[PDB]
Amino acid sequence: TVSRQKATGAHFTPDKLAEVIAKRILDYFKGEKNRVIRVLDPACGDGELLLAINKVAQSMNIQLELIGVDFDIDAINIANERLSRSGHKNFRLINKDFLEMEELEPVDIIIANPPYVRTQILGAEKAQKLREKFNLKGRVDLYQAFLVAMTQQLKSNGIIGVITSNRYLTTKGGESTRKFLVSNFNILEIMDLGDSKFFEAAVLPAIFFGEKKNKEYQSNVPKFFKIYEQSDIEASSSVNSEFNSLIELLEVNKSGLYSVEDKTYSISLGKIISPENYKEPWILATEDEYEWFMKVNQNAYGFIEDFAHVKVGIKTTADSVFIRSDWGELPEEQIPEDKLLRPIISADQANKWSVSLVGNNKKVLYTHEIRDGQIKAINLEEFPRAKNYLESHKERLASRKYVLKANRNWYEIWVPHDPSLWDKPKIIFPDTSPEPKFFYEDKGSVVDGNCYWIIPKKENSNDILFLIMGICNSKFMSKYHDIAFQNKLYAGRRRYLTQYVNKYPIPDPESIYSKEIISLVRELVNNKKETQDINEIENRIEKLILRAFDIES
DNA sequence: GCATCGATCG
């Protein structure tokens, strides 16, 4: 179900992190600080951020006027109690919806942790309302609308320090957020906390410190701070252990490895390079990494998007009904005809180059076909057993409103793709993965929703698919990915999405090095008698890829 | 049509 905390985003910020954010805000503030400074928290909740910033300000002998807004009355009451029990008298709380979906004069400082509510929980209607009101595109999240609103409620030269999900840094839905941030603020600092797990909830948070633009026109170079968990440590890399708690690591000004308790964290500090190009994800990398990235891009002949279609698997929107392995254990009246049961490949049966399989027994009840040259859903009158099987789940299948709004049948697979494209030789790879697992497939099976597949644009997969495979499975491409597309989940899992794989560079497919790579990949995928010679061939491929683009790192 | 996005989700 969807808990009230899930729909309202009621997660409170830990004490030490709040203090760190408040201290950075008061360090970046360069505006008078002798009069009463107004501070705003548009989603104050418990009032933790206001308490932290007031503690720091009273440490600096700075008088604040704290203002909190929250549409829940229990949060208002507890925040009022906590603020009264402190030694502060000048505060004010407002029980209202901040997005306004009285009056308030503009503010000098904004410290905020807005709620992160995805588009599915908001519903399409409120999502389109928020998009129309705050000029947002794509799958809007609530914190983006909150950013727009709280920025509109801020003075010129005022400092914002706001912690949100980091996903706006790399997704295409965060394009609008990146555009807004770079349009309205002189970016002071962007801290990607990565997988440090400060909150009990599963989220990778990022903090944004900025100064709102004026009109006299200003300068400063935007810097970033990235910290991630490091599982694989290089032998020649030294680790620093001069810090006890993780909260002490957010005040380090030297990049490198730091050991805290049971974990080792890689910390990088550098500059944001040209954030005005908000189209592509904002690359947070050091100088050497960025120069290597730019050199690889300059020496590249093209990209995968120019050579091959990168499609997603089937999205049935009812996996428990359409994809099963126990088709023979069902009653004989409901066992569908084998004409409809097509073998499928999931993300679990995924190795590099090629998997041996076991028949998987995983088969999908494919509901579409090529009738009169077009893609049409099947007729259940021809398949009575499949009709009965689907009548068994009619309740769950007909509860999909988006299917009925499209004037489509209730028993259909939502995204069936083209039934004739499955027979083409293709590359397959899983989405969620710590390592690239791209492999070749000839037998003409269907691809699962947790996987993507690749088919050539020109009708000659004779060599291009093999070259793309040899490129994608290399450590070179892994470094390129970790530099360019920084979308990671917990435990080092990268996201191999279409918007990321389309930007994989490709060397000249008629180079001698490229042809040797193609031959080596053919040997790897065809013959399966190799064991640890696979590592030798892979290292040879690495050296050939290096010679294809440029030499080493 | 078809790829996204996840205060992930047990």
Add this chain to the structure above:
DNA sequence: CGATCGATGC
């Protein structure tokens, strides 16, 4: 620890 899977946007 580890790999979602179904509403959603365009």
